[PDB]
Amino acid sequence: QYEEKVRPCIDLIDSLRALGVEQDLALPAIAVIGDQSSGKSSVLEALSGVALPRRCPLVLKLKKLVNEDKWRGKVSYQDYEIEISDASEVEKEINKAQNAIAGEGISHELITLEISSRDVPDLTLIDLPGITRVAVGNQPADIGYKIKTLIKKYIQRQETISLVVVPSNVDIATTEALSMAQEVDPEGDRTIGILTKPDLVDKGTEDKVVDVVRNLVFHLKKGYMIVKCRGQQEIQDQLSLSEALQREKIFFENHPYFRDLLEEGKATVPSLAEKLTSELITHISKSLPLLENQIKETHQRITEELQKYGVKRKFLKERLARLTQARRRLAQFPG
Amino acid sequence: QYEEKVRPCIDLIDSLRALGVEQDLALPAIAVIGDQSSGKSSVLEALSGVALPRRCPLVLKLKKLVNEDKWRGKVSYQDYEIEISDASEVEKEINKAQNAIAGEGISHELITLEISSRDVPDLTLIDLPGITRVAVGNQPADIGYKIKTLIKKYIQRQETISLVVVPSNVDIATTEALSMAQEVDPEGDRTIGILTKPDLVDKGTEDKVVDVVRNLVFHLKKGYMIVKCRGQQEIQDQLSLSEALQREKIFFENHPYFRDLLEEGKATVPSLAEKLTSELITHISKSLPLLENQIKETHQRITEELQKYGVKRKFLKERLARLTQARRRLAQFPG
Numbered sequence: 001q002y003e004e005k006v007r008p009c010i011d012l013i014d015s016l017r018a019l020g021v022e023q024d025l026a027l028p029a030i031a032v033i034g035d036q037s038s039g040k041s042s043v044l045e046a047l048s049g050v051a052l053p054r055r056c057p058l059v060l061k062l063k064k065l066v067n068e069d070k071w072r073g074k075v076s077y078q079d080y081e082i083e084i085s086d087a088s089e090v091e092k093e094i095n096k097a098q099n100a101i102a103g104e105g106i107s108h109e110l111i112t113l114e115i116s117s118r119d120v121p122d123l124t125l126i127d128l129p130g131i132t133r134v135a136v137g138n139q140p141a142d143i144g145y146k147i148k149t150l151i152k153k154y155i156q157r158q159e160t161i162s163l164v165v166v167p168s169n170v171d172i173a174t175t176e177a178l179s180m181a182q183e184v185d186p187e188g189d190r191t192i193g194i195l196t197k198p199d200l201v202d203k204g205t206e207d208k209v210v211d212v213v214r215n216l217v218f219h220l221k222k223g224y225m226i227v228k229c230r231g232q233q234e235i236q237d238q239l240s241l242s243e244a245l246q247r248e249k250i251f252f253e254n255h256p257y258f259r260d261l262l263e264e265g266k267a268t269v270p271s272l273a274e275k276l277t278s279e280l281i282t283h284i285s286k287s288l289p290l291l292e293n294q295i296k297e298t299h300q301r302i303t304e305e306l307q308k309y310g311v312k313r314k315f316l317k318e319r320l321a322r323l324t325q326a327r328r329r330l331a332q333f334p335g
Numbered sequence: 336q337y338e339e340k341v342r343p344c345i346d347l348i349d350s351l352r353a354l355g356v357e358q359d360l361a362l363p364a365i366a367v368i369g370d371q372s373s374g375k376s377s378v379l380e381a382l383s384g385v386a387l388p389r390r391c392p393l394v395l396k397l398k399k400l401v402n403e404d405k406w407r408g409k410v411s412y413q414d415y416e417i418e419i420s421d422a423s424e425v426e427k428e429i430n431k432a433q434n435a436i437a438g439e440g441i442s443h444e445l446i447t448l449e450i451s452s453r454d455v456p457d458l459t460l461i462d463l464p465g466i467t468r469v470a471v472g473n474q475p476a477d478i479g480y481k482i483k484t485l486i487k488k489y490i491q492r493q494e495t496i497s498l499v500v501v502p503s504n505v506d507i508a509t510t511e512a513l514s515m516a517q518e519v520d521p522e523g524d525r526t527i528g529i530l531t532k533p534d535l536v537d538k539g540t541e542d543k544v545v546d547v548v549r550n551l552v553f554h555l556k557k558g559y560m561i562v563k564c565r566g567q568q569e570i571q572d573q574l575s576l577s578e579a580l581q582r583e584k585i586f587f588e589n590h591p592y593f594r595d596l597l598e599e600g601k602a603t604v605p606s607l608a609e610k611l612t613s614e615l616i617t618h619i620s621k622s623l624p625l626l627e628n629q630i631k632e633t634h635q636r637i638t639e640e641l642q643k644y645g646v647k648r649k650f651l652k653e654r655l656a657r658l659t660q661a662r663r664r665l666a667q668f669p670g
């Protein structure tokens with residue numbers, strides 16, 4: 001059992017997404033973006049409390065158990081739906097997901113990871129493959145372009161909040177992820193910054209980081225958070241994610257510069273978790289009253305096009321049947 | 336007095352550049368490019384042995400004294416030419432240069448720094464302003480674009496070797512500087528990589544760095560070098576550049592991973608210095624035999640255009656007078 005005061009809104013959006021209506025209907029979403037090796041999957045590991053594999057969208061559904069506190073997991077992709085038993089079984093199951101989902105560049109097909117735990121927020125996130133600028137190894141030359149196209153698909157929509165992951169040890173102005181966010185959101189009204197790797201910041205440089213997190217260099221309405229996740233040695237030693245939280249807490253409390261950020265409510269995964277639930281709820285709340293008319297408008301313009309060209313047909317009869325299903329599912333809200 | 340076996344070639348190119356002929360005549364060059372805060376000016380500080388200020392092209396002319404060993408410096412920009420007395424006087428003089436040269440974005444006007452010292456290589460470099468992707472602060476929104484245009488002006492030319500500065504603590508595939516190099520040089524035949532900040536690499540991650548420097552991730556004909564320059568605390572303590580070399584030496588000799596790179600001749604500023612002189616000489620050598628005909632071809636096509644439109648006139652009579660001066664100066668070679 002969950003908090004039935006937060007779940008209905010989150011579950012509603014998840015159900016609409018799972019209907020395959022997002023091609024024609026923008027749905028409230030938090031898209032996670034970052035340059036390759038910015039620590040994006042680390043943040044997800046910390047938020048979900050589970051290890052993820054060493055590309056295509058990943059829908060992460062986190063559900064906070066208020067009740068009996070039995071860890072449950074589930075992975076869905078295509079026709080597969082597989083119940084996970086242990087938390088350390090998860091990495092294995094996504095590895096498998098990522099296998100079936102990728103035959104030969106980037107895939108637009110969704111893998112959905114659902115986790116019910118005492119230690120997870122009530123939160124849905126869409127994680128998007130890391131941005132590269134140079135093509136390395138045996139991957140195609142247009143892989144960067146394709147990654148960008150997949151990212152734009154989400155982030156160009158007004159209904160998407162961009163969650164930008166940036167390492168503290170790189171200049172904020174050089175981030176491609178943030179650059180893309182500024183492109184679609186010049187005012188910086190639907191972008192949140194997560195800084196990582198605060199332990200790797202050059203000594204004498206920490207004040208620059210503080211300036212960023214305090215919203216003084218590149219301004220974001222919704223602000224910034226700073227986090228410390230497992231370093232490579234800690235991953236190499238298979239350090240538990242529970243201990244990683246404990247270590248993060250100690251790191252910020254003892255930090256000569258970052259303690260201020262902690263006291264200002266701008267540090268640690270637990271505080272990030274709460275901030276992301278608030279942001280998600282506020283953002284779904286914004287779309288709630290409009291959904292019924294947007295569905296109606298779009299069902300109207302697709303019926304127009306149906307009449308124009310046909311009256312490819314059976315494909316448009318499948319789009320409309322999905323939109324009808326969206327209207328029905330919305331009519332059930334909040335139950 | 337200098338080694339008159341290396342100076343004639345380097346001085347020849349410098350004299351042609353100073354004639355203002357590079358608009359119509361590609362000249363052998365090493366352009367230094369990097370993302371903002373990649374440690375680019377640090378590398379230049381180490382190579383030149385002098386401190387540089389905290390934007391427009393900077394032509395760095397380094398001349399190794401074989402003779403009496405009296406440190407000499409000179410800064411030229413527009414009509415100014417100012418003789419520098421001390422090595423620590425330099426930062427001040429470029430600050431002044433950068434003032435006169437920038438009235439209100441990026442300037443294409445050249446500031447030329449000439450240094451004659453026992454401790455400098457025989458080397459000319461064109462340093463280009465750092466790349467940004469996000470516009471911060473009170474700077475114009477198209478500043479990134481303008482920086483890129485200035486960089487492309489140099490690096491699109493076959494006669495330009497791109498010297499790409501990349502920090503070891505960022506994923507090689509995410510570098511915009513390297514991305515631009517790959518764009519104009521897909522084969523990777525006229526690009527050199529300099530990795531910086533090897534001390535800031537995450538523990539358990541050093542092997543990735545080694546892989547890069549050994550030319551195994553993104554392949555460059557001319558290869559990679561790795562260097563350690565002053566960190567911010569050391570700059571804050573005004574650590575001498577002589578001691579910085581000593582420290583770099585000790586750092587690589589004692590490093591559990593990077594010692595191999597040192598023994599493979601791929602580390603330290605002194606080894607970089609020698610590699611850059613070789614590369615410059617080889618590259619000027621490549622253009623030497625062609626220069627006379629290229630000048631003639633271009634003097635021919637500008638006389639064609641002179642005839643076409645005119646026969647704006649006095650501007651083309653000034654381009655041709657510069658090309659005539661280039662042909663004369665070449666006719667003096669090697670004296």
Ligand SMILES: Nc1nc2c(ncn2[C@@H]2O[C@H](COP(=O)(O)OP(=O)(O)O)[C@@H](O)[C@H]2O)c(=O)[nH]1
Binds near residue numbers: 034037200
């Ligand atoms: N020291 C340190 N290392 C981190 C931190 N966050 C992430 N990393 C490391 O940075 C690397 C890149 O992180 P990852 O999550 O794989 O990046 P992604 O490619 O953006 O998903 C990994 O080796 C992590 O161990 C941090 O807060 N501190």
Ligand SMILES: Nc1nc2c(ncn2[C@@H]2O[C@H](COP(=O)(O)OP(=O)(O)O)[C@@H](O)[C@H]2O)c(=O)[nH]1
Binds near residue numbers: 371564565567568
């Ligand atoms: N620890 C460490 N810091 C470095 C190294 N090289 C450069 N830095 C620092 O990184 C910052 C950016 O360097 P800078 O040369 O100003 O970058 P630019 O903007 O590319 O010219 C400066 O604060 C330097 O002190 C290095 O090898 N080690």
